[model samples]
Target: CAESCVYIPCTVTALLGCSCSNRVCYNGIP
Candidate 1:
């Protein structure tokens, strides 16, 4: 297995409101 860091897009929801996240690892999607 491998590790990685990335930045995800932010989305705005109705109830939860703006959704954002910090650096992620373990998988790659970019």
Candidate 2:
């Protein structure tokens, strides 16, 4: 699945691993 954005940020939970606090993700969905 693709992670869309609406002023969205790291919404990582139990599957993807999001890091960078600048974008949606760094290691997980982009």
Give all candidates' CA lDDT scores: 0.29, 0.46
RMSD of each: 9.6, 4.0
* Residue-level lDDT tens digits of model 1 in 1-28: 1222334433222123333335323222
Question: Which ten contiguous residues of candidate 2 have the minimum total lDDT?
Answer: 1-10
Best by TM-score: 2
Provide the lDDT at 4 for model 1.
23
Compared with the true structure, what per-residue lDDT tens digits does model 2 show for residues 1-30? 234333665465215665544534456345
Displacement of residue 15 (Cα, Å) in model 2 is 4.8
Which candidate has the top score in lDDT? 2
